[PDB]
Amino acid sequence: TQQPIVTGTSVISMKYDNGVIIAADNLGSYGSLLRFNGVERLIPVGDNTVVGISGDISDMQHIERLLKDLVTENAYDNPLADAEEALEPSYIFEYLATVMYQRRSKMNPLWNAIIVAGVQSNGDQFLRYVNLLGVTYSSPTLATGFGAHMANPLLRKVVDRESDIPKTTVQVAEEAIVNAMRVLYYRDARSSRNFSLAIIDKNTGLTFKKNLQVENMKWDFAKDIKGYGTQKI
Amino acid sequence: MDIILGIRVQDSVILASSKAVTRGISVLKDSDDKTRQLSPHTLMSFAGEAGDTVQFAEYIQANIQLYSIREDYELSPQAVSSFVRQELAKSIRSRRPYQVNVLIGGYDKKKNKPELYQIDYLGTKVELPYGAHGYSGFYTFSLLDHHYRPDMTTEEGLDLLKLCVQELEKRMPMDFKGVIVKIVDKDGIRQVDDF
Amino acid sequence: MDIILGIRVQDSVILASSKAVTRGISVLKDSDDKTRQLSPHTLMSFAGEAGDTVQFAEYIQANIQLYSIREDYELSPQAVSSFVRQELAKSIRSRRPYQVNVLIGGYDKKKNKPELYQIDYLGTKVELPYGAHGYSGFYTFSLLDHHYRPDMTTEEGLDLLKLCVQELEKRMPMDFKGVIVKIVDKDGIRQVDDF
Amino acid sequence: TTTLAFRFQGGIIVAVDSRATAGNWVASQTVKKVIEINPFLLGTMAGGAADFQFWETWLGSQCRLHELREKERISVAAASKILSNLVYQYKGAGLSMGTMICGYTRKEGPTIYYVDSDGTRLKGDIFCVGSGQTFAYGVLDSNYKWDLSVEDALYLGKRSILAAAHRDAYSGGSVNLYHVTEDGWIYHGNHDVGELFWKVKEEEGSFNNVIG
Amino acid sequence: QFNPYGDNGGTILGIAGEDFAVLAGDTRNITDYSINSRYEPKVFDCGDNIVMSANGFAADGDALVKRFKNSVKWYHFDHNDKKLSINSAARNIQHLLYGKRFFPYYVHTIIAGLDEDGKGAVYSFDPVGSYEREQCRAGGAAASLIMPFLDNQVNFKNQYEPGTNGKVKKPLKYLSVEEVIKLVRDSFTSATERHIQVGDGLEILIVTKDGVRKEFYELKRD
Amino acid sequence: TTIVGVKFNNGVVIAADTRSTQGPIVADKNCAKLHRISPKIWCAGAGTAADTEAVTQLIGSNIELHSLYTSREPRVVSALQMLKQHLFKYQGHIGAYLIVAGVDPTGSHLFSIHAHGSTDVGYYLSLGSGSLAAMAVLESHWKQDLTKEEAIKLASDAIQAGIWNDLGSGSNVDVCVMEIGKDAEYLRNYLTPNVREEKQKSYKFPRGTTAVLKESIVNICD
Amino acid sequence: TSIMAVTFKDGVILGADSRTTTGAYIANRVTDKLTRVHDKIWCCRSGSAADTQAIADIVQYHLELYTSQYGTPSTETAASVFKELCYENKDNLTAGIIVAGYDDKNKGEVYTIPLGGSVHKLPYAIAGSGSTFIYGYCDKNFRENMSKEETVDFIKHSLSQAIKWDGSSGGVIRMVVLTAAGVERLIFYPDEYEQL
Amino acid sequence: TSIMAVTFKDGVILGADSRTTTGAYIANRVTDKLTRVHDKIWCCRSGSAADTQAIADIVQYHLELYTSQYGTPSTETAASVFKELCYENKDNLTAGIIVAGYDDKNKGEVYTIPLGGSVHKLPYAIAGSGSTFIYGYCDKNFRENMSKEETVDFIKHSLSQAIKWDGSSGGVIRMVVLTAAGVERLIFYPDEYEQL
Amino acid sequence: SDPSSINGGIVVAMTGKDCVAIACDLRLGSQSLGVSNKFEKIFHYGHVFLGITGLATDVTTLNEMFRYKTNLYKLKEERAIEPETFTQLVSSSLYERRFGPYFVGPVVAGINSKSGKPFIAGFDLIGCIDEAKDFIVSGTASDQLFGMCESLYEPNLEPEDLFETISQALLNAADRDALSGWGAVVYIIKKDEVVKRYLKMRQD
C-alpha cells in the first residue's frame, strides 16, 4: 500500500500513417507545489521504442533502471542484439505489464500510468497502455490522467478509427499533439509549459524533441472580463 | 412481545398472541395479554418495541372509543384499520417513531363478514385470510398455505391455529410461554381460556 | 450449546447438559449429547462456540485415551483437569483460540472421592461442590447455595438438580429442550434416561 | 436457497430448490443443489456455491481413495467427518457452507449428517437448510412419520420445497428429488415450480389464498 | 488506501445451438466515465475449439485467459496431444478461479464450444469458480438487461401455445445460426441504448466442427 | 451531462446533450436540458435533474412577476442574482450547475452558476460530466468576433465531443440562439447523430401467447 | 489563489492571479478576483468562491446603504463590515479576504482578514495558497512610500513567483490602482511575467 | 527544519538551522543537521530525526566499506545509496535528505531526495518545512558560478527568512563549505542574521 | 435497509396506436418473506392512470394523496384532470418533499380526452419528469424491464398486440427479480373503454 509523492501528469500519444507520436511535460509536482522542472518523463528504449510514464516519479525512476537493465541483459550472448534479436516495443510492453500486474497482486503497486509507443520490426505501429492496476488497452489514440479527458477528444477528431490512420500524416498528427499540450496547459493545474515530444517513424526512425514550449496562446480576451456578474468597472 | 398470529375463517377472525414478556435474561411475566378491544366487534393485537406497543395500542383505543361516543356508532374494521395505518404512516417520519406492528381482527356487521388486517410499523396495510408479524410468519405462512381453506369453521380455525403454535414451540429458539387466543365474530369478542 | 450444570455429592458427580442445538431462528436438534467420556471414571461436558466445542472435546478424549493405552492406567480427575486447563491456557494466546467452556466430573478411585472441576475458555480452573457455565449460574448458584448439603446421596442430588432445571425452564428466555443427565461414581459412568 | 433431507423406512429423501440469486437479481433458475459424491452418497448446497461444489467434489475424491486403500465402502460418518474437519481448518477464512451429507450403508443404515462452515457436525433424522428452511420445516414436521412409503415420502419432500419456493423470495425455479437406498441413490426428476404449483393447488385443494 | 480492483465495464453473451455455439462480446473498454478503447477484444480462441471470455476487471480477465491458454498448452504436452473437451476445460477453470478464493479474479467467465457428442455447449462461471452448463448466458455490465430477453426468446419462457388456455407451453427447439446471430445483434443494440458502458462495436465468435469463425458489427459510439 | 455557452457578434448561444442517467443506466434518451427563464433568457442545466428544473422554474416564475411589476423586460443579472442567492442559501444541497445566458436591454450575457452559489463570467463556458471534452474543443477552436453560424457550429461541436467521449452524455444536441433585436430561437434536436439502426427481427407475438387468468371492464366514468 | 494588496506614496494597489480550480481542473483561467465594494474600496478574494462572493455582495449592499445615509465610508468601516460577517459566521465560511481602499485623509490602507475573522491593518498584505512561497521575497523587497511604477513591479514580480510555484495559481495577473486620480485596471499576460 | 545546499565556483556549501521540535516545544535549539557520510560528502537532514539518523549511519557505513575496496566514492554514488534506502523503505520512513559533495573531476554537486525516494540532481536545493517560504526568494536570487562570499550570503539571507516565518525553524545557522581547500564549518548567531 | 427495495415490485407502461397500456406485478414482501399476492400498484383518478413502485406505505399514502387532490381539482375545475396536467401535479407534490422524500417510482398513463393523444410519463422519487413516446419502466426489476422493452417494443401496435408485448415484457423481467412477481395485472386503455387482465405467471 502506497501513496504517490512526487508526481508527473498527462502522457498523450497517437498513431499516424508511418508511425507513432508521444508527448509529456517536464514537471515533477509535489502536491500543489510545482517542485521540479527538469524532469524527463519520456524514456527511449533502443531506436524503436519510447516509454511515456506518469504518476509517482520515484517509481518512474525504478522503471527507468529496469528498462536500462533490460537492454544490458538482452545484449548478453546475443550477436543479433542490434539486428533481428533487438528489443521490440511489444517485448518491452509485455515485460512492464507483467511487472505492473504482479506488483498490484502483492498489494504493493508501482503507482504509474504507462504508455509504450513504438514501431515493430515489420513496420507495424505499436501503441499500448498499462497502469498500477495491471490494466492494459490499445487504441489509435491513448492518454493518461487529464489527457484522457481533454486530449483524446481532440486526437480522436483526427483518427477516430483504424481506417483514419493511413490518411493521417506526421505533420497533421504532430500538430494535433502540440495543440493538445496547449489545451492541457490551459486547464490542468499540475501541468507545465515546457514539454518533450517523441516521434517513432518506420522510415526516419526515432526523433526525440526536448525543451519544447506551449505557444500561440489566447489570453487577450481576459482584459474584457470584469467581476463575476453585476460588476462593470 | 414477539409472536402474534391471525386467521380469518368463514364467520370469524381468530387472534393468537404470546404471553411472555422478557426483559434481559429473565422472563418477567408469562400471562401477558398483548391486545386491546378498540370497539365491541374490533380487536387489535400488537408486538414491537417495549413501552411503544401498549402506549400506541391504548392511544388508538382511546380515539376509537371517542368516535363511538360522539357518533353513537361503531366504525367498520376497514375504517379503523385505515385510521390506524395513517397514524403509523405519520409516525414513521416523526422525531421518534412508534416501533409497533399490529393485527386488526374485526367483524363487519353491515357486510356480515370477518376481516383481518396486517399493518407494520411503517404503515403498510394488507387485508389477509391469515397474517403474522415478526419471525412467526417464517413458520406459519407455509403451514397455512397448505392447510387453510376459506370456508372453515371457528373450530377448524382453532385446530389450524393449534397446528401453528405446535410448530412454533418445536422450532422457535425462545420460550414464548404459550398464547392467549381470542375470537371475533357477529356476537363480539370472547377469550378461549383453555389453550 | 448453552446450559451445562454439575453437582458433586457424597459418592458421585452429576452432570446435566441441555439437548438443544439452535441455528438462527431454528432449533435444528433437540436430543444433542454435549459430553464425552475421557476415561471410564471421567466425564467432560462442554459449551461454547459452534464446532470448537466438539472439536476440542474429541481432541482431549483422544489424548486421554492415548495415555490410558500407553501406561495401562487411568489418570486421576485432578490430572486430567490439569491437562485440559493447560490446553485451554495455551489456546487463549493462539492465532484462533478455542472458545470452549467445560465441566469435568470424575471419581478418583485411589481417594474414593467424587470430584467436579469447572474450567472456562481462558483456562481458569476451580474445584467445586457445584458448578455451571454461561447464564445458567445466575439462577442455579444461589439456589444450590441454599439447598445443597455436602453429605447428600445421588437421589438427593438428582432432586436438587430437578429443582435447578425447573427454575431455568421458568425464567430462561430460550427453550433449551430439557437436559441429558449423567452420573459418575465408583462403578463408572451411566445415563439417566427418564428426566 | 431451500434444501431438505429426512430419514425414513425406505431410506432417505433429499429435496432441493434450483434458484440462485445475487441480491434481488435471479442469477439462475436451473442450479444443481445436489452433488453426486458417489453412487451411494449425496450432498446438498446451501451458502457458498463454489465452496459446496469444490469441496464436495473433493470429498468424492477422498471417498474414492478410501475404498481403494481399505477395499470397503466409506461410512457416512467417516465421509461427513472428512468434510467437517477440512472446513474447520478454514474456520475464520470466510467459507460459507451448510450441507446434509446423506448415505445408506450396511453398518449404519440410512444416515444424515448436517455439516457446517462453523465446524458443526450433527447426526439427525430431519434437516432443513437455507433461506426458506423454516417454510419447509412447517410442512415436514406436521406430516413426517417413520412409516411413510417411498411414494408418499418423495411427495412430502417435493411439497415442502414448493411451500418454501412460494413464500421465500430467494427460493424456487424447480424441485430436484432424490431417493437414497442401500444399493445407491435414485434420481426422481426435475419439477418446475411454475407448473407444480398449479398442479398441486388443484389436486390438493391447497393455496386457496392464491387465485388460479 | 490502495484498491487493487477496478471495473472495465462491457458485456458478454453465449448461446448454444444444435451443432454450433456462439460467444459474443462488445469491444468497448472503460474506466469511470472515460472510454479507454473502442476496439479492445475480450473474446478469445483458446484452441481445441474452445472460445473464452472473462468480463469484469480486465487485468484479472487477461490474467485468467492467459493462464487457461497456458493450461491447454500443457495439457497437450502431458497427455499426448489429447484434445481438451469443453467439460474438462470447465472443471480446469474452476480450479484456476477457486485457487484465488480469498483474493478473487473479479470476472464473470463464459466459455463456449462443442461437447463430445458434437452438440453446442456453453459454460458460465462466478468469480470464485462455481460453474454450470447452460443453453444461454449473458455476463457483465448489461447482463441484467439481456438475460431476461434470452429467457423469452431462446428458452421460450412465459410463452404459451395460442388458444390452449395457457395449458400447453411453446415447445423448445434448437435455433439456426442465422436466428441466433439476429438475437445477439438485437440484444447488444438494446443493451447499448440503455447502458452507458456498452457500445462502440460487437465481435461474435462462432464455433462449429469446421473451426472458429468471426463476425464484427458496429455499435453506437455515444 | 454536457452543456455549453458561446458568445458571438450580436448575441449568445447555448447548447446541451439529451441524455439522463440513473447510475450506469440511461433513464431518458431525449430529455430537455435547455430551460426558459424568460422569453429571451435561457438556461442550460447539469447535475441533479429535478433541482435544475425546480430552481429554473422558481426563478423563472419570480422573474415573470418582477417583469410585470417593473413594466420592464427581465435582465440576465437579475436571474443570475436570484439563482445564486437561492443556491448559496442551501449550501450546495440543491445540486444545480447552470449556464445562464440571454439578451436584455443592457445587451447580451453569458454566465455560469455552481451548486454552492458561485458565478463566473465568460465568452465560452462548459459544465457537467463532459465539460472537459467540450472545453477541449472550445479552447482549440474559439476566437473573438464569432458570427452566428460559427458560434452554433462551435457550440454543437463542443456538445458532440461530450456525446462521443463522455459516458455521462449522449443522444442528441439541443441548441438555443439568443440574438439582440430578435426572438430567441429554440432548436430542439438540432442534431440527431444517434438514430437507432433497424432491428434484425420483429418481436411481435402471436395473439394468445400470454396466459390469462381473469378479464374485466374497468369503469372510468361517473 | 495568490492575492496581495500594497500601500504606496499615491495610494494603494491590489493584485491577484486569475485561476479558479475544482480539484486539479482549472474551471476558469481568466477569473476576476479583485472586486468592487465601493468607488475606491476594493477587495481581493481567496478561499471558497461561493462564500467570498456572497460576503462581498452583502458588504457592497451595506456600503451602498451606508453611503445613502452617512456619505462615503472609510476603508476601516468597510473592513469592519467584512470582519463582522467573517467572524460571526466563522463555522460556516472559508474566506480569506484582503480589503484595500483610498481615502483622501487616510490615503492608502490595507486590512487583511484571515479565516478566523480577525482584522489586521498592514502596510501590505499577502494571502491565498500561493502566498506561502513569497513571504521571504516580499519581506526582503517591500519598502514604504514606493512609487506607482515600483509598486507595480513589486506586485508583478511577487505574484509571478507565487504563480510559478503554486499549482493552484496562474493565468493573467490583474491589478487595480487606487489613488486620488481615480481607478485604473491593469492586466499582465504570461508571456511577459513568466520570463521575469 | 529549514535546509539547503548550493553549488558555486569553488565547490558546494550546505546550510541548515538548529531547531528540533517535539510539537511546539523545542527539544534542542543547537542541533547539528549537517552530517558527514564521507570526508567531502555531507548531507542535510529533514523529517524524522530518528529515521534520517539511522539512514545516515548506514550510508556512512556503506561508503566506509566502499572506500576500503574501491577508493573514494562519487557524490552520485553516495546519493544512490541514500535513494536505495529511502525508496525501498518508503512505507516506514519520513526522511527528506539533501546530499552534497565535492569531487575534483565533477566539482560541486547537489542531489535532493524527497519523501518518495526519488533522486533529483540540481544546481541548488532547498528542503524542510521552512523551505516553502523561500522558493520565491531563492529562485530570484540564485546565480550559477557564485563566489564563496556570495554563496554564504545567499544561504544566510535565505535561511534567515525561512527561520523568520517558520516556527519549526530557528536557532543558529550552521554551514559547511566543501572545496578543494578542505572542509570549513561556519556558524551564524541570531543577533547577526535576524536584522538582515 | 434500502427503502426502495424492502417491499419490492414493478410497473411498466407502453403506448400503441390510439391506446396505452400500463401493467404491474402483485407482490408485497418484507425482504425475503412474501407477505401478500394481492397488492395492486396501479390506481386511477378518472381516466388518468397512475402506477407506483417502491416503499409500500408511501405507495398507499400517495394514492390517497392524489385521490384527495384530484377530487378537489374536479370540484373546482368542473372537469376531470388530464394526464399532462396530472403529471405536473405529481412532480410538484414529490419535489415539495425534496429533503425528506417519498421512496417511490410513479408512472402516469392515459389518453388525453380532448386531443385523443396517448400519453405516458415516469418520475424519480424527487419529482423529475421523464416523458417518453415508447415506454416507461419502474421498480426493483427496472434494468430487466429496460432490456425487455427496448428489444420487444415497436411503434403503433394495435391494442390486442400491445397487450402481448407489455405482458411478455413484465413477466420475463419479473422472473429474473427475486422481489417482483407473485401475479400480474395489465390495463389496456382505449379512448372510451378500459380492459383489465390478470396474467398467469410462475408463483415463486
Ligand SMILES: *[C@@](C)(CO)[C@](*)(O)[C@H](Cc1ccccc1)NC(=O)[C@H](Cc1ccc(OC)cc1)NC(=O)[C@H](C)NC(=O)CN1CCOCC1
Ligand atoms: C448528466 C447526465 C450527468 O450524468 C447531467 O448532469 C444530467 C442533467 C440533467 C438531466 C435531466 C434534466 C436536466 C439536467 N443529470 C442527470 O441525468 C442526473 C445525474 C445525477 C444522478 C444522481 C446525482 O446524485 C446527486 C446527481 C446527478 N440524473 C438524475 O438526477 C436522475 C433523473 N435522478 C436520480 O438519479 C434520482 N436521484 C436524484 C438525486 O437525489 C437522489 C436520487
Ligand SMILES: *[C@@](C)(CO)[C@](*)(O)[C@H](Cc1ccccc1)NC(=O)[C@H](Cc1ccc(OC)cc1)NC(=O)[C@H](C)NC(=O)CN1CCOCC1
Ligand atoms: C485559489 C485558486 C485556491 O485557494 C483561490 O483561493 C480561489 C479564490 C477564488 C476563486 C474564484 C473567484 C474568486 C476567488 N479559490 C478557488 O478557486 C476555490 C478553491 C476552494 C474551494 C473550496 C474551499 O473550501 C470551501 C477552499 C478553496 N474554488 C471553488 O470554490 C470552486 C469554484 N468550487 C469548488 O471547488 C466546489 N467546492 C465547493 C465547496 O466545497 C468543496 C467543493
Ligand SMILES: *[C@@](C)(CO)[C@](*)(O)[C@H](Cc1ccccc1)NC(=O)[C@H](Cc1ccc(OC)cc1)NC(=O)[C@H](C)NC(=O)CN1CCOCC1
Ligand atoms: C524541522 C524542525 C521540522 O520538519 C526538521 O525537519 C527536523 C529535522 C531534524 C531534526 C533533528 C536532527 C536533524 C534533523 N525534524 C524534527 O525536529 C522532527 C519533527 C518531525 C518528527 C516526526 C516526523 O514524522 C515521523 C516528522 C518531523 N522531530 C523529531 O523527530 C523529534 C525529535 N521526535 C518527535 O517528534 C517524536 N515523534 C517521533 C515520530 O513519531 C511522532 C512522534
Ligand SMILES: [Mg+2]
Ligand atoms: Mg420464491
Ligand SMILES: [Mg+2]
Ligand atoms: Mg460517450
Ligand SMILES: [Mg+2]
Ligand atoms: Mg521510524
Ligand SMILES: [Mg+2]
Ligand atoms: Mg523561527
